[PDB]
Amino acid sequence: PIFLNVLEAIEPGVVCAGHDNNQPDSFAALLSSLNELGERQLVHVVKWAKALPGFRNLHVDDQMAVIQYSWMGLMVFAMGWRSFTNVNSRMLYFAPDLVFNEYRMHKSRMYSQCVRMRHLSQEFGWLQITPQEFLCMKALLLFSIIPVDGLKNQKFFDELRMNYIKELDRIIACKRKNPTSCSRRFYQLTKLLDSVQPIARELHQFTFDLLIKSHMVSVDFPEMMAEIISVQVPKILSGKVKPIYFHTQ
Ligand SMILES: C[C@]12CC[C@H]3[C@@H](CCC4=CC(=O)CC[C@@]43C)[C@@H]1CC[C@@H]2O
Ligand SMILES: Oc1ccc(C2Nc3cccc4cccc(c34)N2)cc1O
């Protein structure tokens, strides 16, 4: 249970958005708080990524790259898990102080993306995802998006990712008998994981589009979000960096 003990030990606690719930729900106010929340969650993502088994064996530029590419997917997934465990997926639980009901979903102007996020959230319920399956899936999301012409040390990346797939396959296969059950299950979970990607990508277009018009629309982006969204996110939009799918889309 060593790999699982570590994944349960390094898991972030609650991150607050710092949203002032006494302000009226406006676009400016909702998206600036989401942006601050993304910025706060980045600090914790960085510290979590670095405590992961084998992570520091990656080349150091590569460690920065996988995090600056995959943060959107990791946070969407974790948020869907929080929504599921806290409000049985009925609303989007970004943070204790920034929970979206239907009105916030409309005012944020991301209503259809929110719907797709609630759908992802509900799959945790429909699939009866266990906390152990959750933590191994989210660890893998870290290794699920890279540049098309490879990382600085692609071989070390490939080995690591292989090992994360094997740990997920093992977290399933601890507790099952005569096995159509075990294939069907791995199939289900690799389908859930592939499904995070098109969602992440919608939110990549959205937040890029917003950063560009952010002065016209009084939305604040803090230091790191603004930098990652202008430097790394367009490499995803332009197709220089692409998700690693299990099944072909
Ligand atoms: C990227 C973004 C700010 C950060 C958001 C993102 C939507 C999903 C998301 C979920 C979280 O739980 C952390 C914040 C993030 C990562 C927002 C959509 C537009 C906005 O600019
Ligand atoms: O080897 C390393 C790999 C990634 C990082 C790392 N990656 C980051 C991405 C985005 C924002 C950051 C802000 C502060 C520190 C970081 C960031 N640190 C630091 C390292 O020293």
Domain locations along the chain: 1-249
Helix (H, G, I), strand (E, B) or coil at 100: strand
| Method of determination used here | X-ray
| Ligand 2, CB within 6 Å, residue ranges | 42, 46, 60, 63-64, 67-68, 224, 228
The phi, psi pair for 14, rounded to 5°, reads -75, 130
Spacing, Cα 34 to ligand 1 middle (Å): 5
Got the DSSP string for 192-217? HHHHHHHHHHHHHHHHHHHHHTTTTT
Task: Tell which residue, 244, 119, 131, has the closest CA to residue 193.
Answer: 244
Helices (H), the chain: 2-9, 27-50, 60-87, 102-107, 111-127, 131-141, 154-173, 181-212, 223-231, 233-237
Q: Is 38 in the pocket of ligand 1 (CB under 6 A)?
A: yes
Cα–Cα dist 73/127, whole Å: 19
Contacts 24+ apart (CB under 8 A), 218-222: 218/28, 219/27, 219/28, 219/31, 219/32, 219/35, 220/32, 220/35, 220/36, 221/35, 222/35, 222/36, 222/39
Ligand that comes closest to the CA of residue 31: 1
Cα–Cα dist 227/232, whole Å: 8
Q: Is 81 in the pocket of ligand 1 (CB under 6 A)?
A: no
Resolution in A: 2.2
- Report the residue among 14, 34, 42 best suited for mutation to probe ligand 1: largest number of ligand atoms under 8 A from its CB: 34
Q: Whose CA is nearest to atom 19 of ligand 1?
A: 207
What is the Rg, in whole angstroms, of the alpha carbon atoms belonging to the chain? 18
Distances (CA, A) of 74 to 44, 78, 103, 124, 142: 12, 6, 25, 15, 7
Spacing, Cα 94 to ligand 1 middle (Å): 8
Per CATH, the architecture of 1-249 is what? Orthogonal Bundle (1.10)
Please give the number of the atom of ligand 2 that sits closest to the Cα of 224: 11
Residue 57 in marked binding region? no
Cα–Cα dist 121/24, whole Å: 26
Helix (H, G, I), strand (E, B) or coil at 18: coil
* DSSP for residue 147: E
